[PDB]
């Protein structure tokens with residue numbers, strides 16, 4: 001199962017560019033209406 | 049007939065207190081709960097806040113908490129006051145009731161709801177102008 | 183205010199400005215000019231007693247249709263101001279009563 005998971009996970013998308021400073025803010029107005037939901041705005045390199 | 053009789057001075061100067069009453073009659077007072085409403089000509093309506101059984105006063109953040117809202121049982125009156133009245137307050141003050149409706153949309157066990165404060169019975173309103181005159 | 187014009191004896195649809203994000207709880211009010219207002223439909227479906235069937239509420243399908251006030255057959259007593267008061271799950275405590283929606287009926291006998 002370990003090897004099968006690694007094999008099926010190998011060809012998918014690498015997420016090394018997600019390591020980036022996340023300007024992130026709370027979403028919830030009322031107290032404890034839902035943390036547990038973080039709206040993070042960040043940078044990400046496009047096609048070019 | 050809960051005729052929310054409102055009676056204020058009718059003529060005030062800036063930076064003093066306005067004393068408008070709100071009578072309860074034709075029905076008990078402790079059974080249900082009452083509140084206050086206001087609106088201005090040219091503008092929309094502006095609730096003042098709410099007084100509940102615990103008598104802790106919920107205030108309006110957009111009015112900078114410069115009012116004195118309360119309630120007294122002796123003469124069956126709702127006691128709303130405005131300290132430091134600005135000249136912009138030349139308008140009419142209303143009365144209203146408040147039924148504490150419980151809006152459910154999730155699970156009660158996790159506090160996944162909220163309370164909506166619905167109002168049914170209102171008053172008539174008295175218009176008071178505030179300026180250098182009294 | 184937004185002046186609106188409609189005919190007589192026609193079903194009327196009244197929608198307020200800001201959108202209904204999240205599950206919403208609409209209340210309607212009858213601010214007749216000069217004297218005290220009164221509510222039309224609260225809880226999005228529950229019309230209070232003393233309100234004729236000409237005023238109908240809008241059921242919730244959890245999305246789609248906005249806060250609509252169904253009014254079938256306006257009469258000589260409906261020249262007033264209609265207010266959209268709504269409680270959603272993103273505005274938290276919906277402190278504000280929102281904007282003012284106006285209607286001025288033409289062809290009134």
Ligand SMILES: *[C@@H]1O[C@H](CO)[C@@H](O[C@@H]2O[C@H](CO)[C@@H](O[C@@H]3O[C@H](CO[C@@H]4O[C@H](CO)[C@@H](O)[C@H](O)[C@@H]4O)[C@@H](O)[C@H](O[C@H]4O[C@H](CO)[C@@H](O)[C@H](O)[C@@H]4O[C@@H]4O[C@H](CO)[C@@H](O)[C@H](O)[C@@H]4O)[C@@H]3O)[C@H](O)[C@H]2NC(C)=O)[C@H](O)[C@H]1NC(C)=O
Pocket residue numbers: 152153154155156157205206207225226227242244
């Ligand atoms: C797991 O554990 C949970 C613990 O709570 C179990 O319950 C869940 O929470 C509640 C309570 O059981 C239920 O969901 C809510 O139910 C209310 C209606 O409650 C009524 O209660 C009566 C008994 O007191 C009962 O006889 C009735 O039959 C009914 O259950 C419902 O109002 C809630 O939804 C509101 O908000 C939704 C949007 O968020 C709207 O889509 C709903 O329509 C509704 O709003 C109103 O809708 C009216 C029109 O229908 C409209 O007129 C009005 O203005 C409002 O807009 C909510 O559905 C459920 O039972 C359960 N919820 C869930 C998601 O499971 C739970 O059963 C248990 N097991 C499982 C399998 O989850």
Ligand SMILES: *[C@@H]1O[C@H](CO)[C@@H](O[C@@H]2O[C@H](CO)[C@@H](O)[C@H](O)[C@H]2NC(C)=O)[C@H](O)[C@H]1NC(C)=O
Pocket residue numbers: 023041042043
């Ligand atoms: C993406 O990178 C840019 C790089 O400049 C960030 O831009 C700066 O953002 C700060 C606030 O976080 C501003 O005070 C600066 O003035 C911005 N500089 C310029 C030149 O615009 C940007 O903020 C980053 N993305 C996010 C979501 O923070």
Ligand SMILES: *[C@@H]1O[C@H](CO)[C@@H](O)[C@H](O)[C@H]1NC(C)=O
Pocket residue numbers: 026035
């Ligand atoms: C905002 O985010 C911080 C993150 O630590 C959290 O502690 C806080 O409860 C959130 N909400 C508010 C209202 O500050």
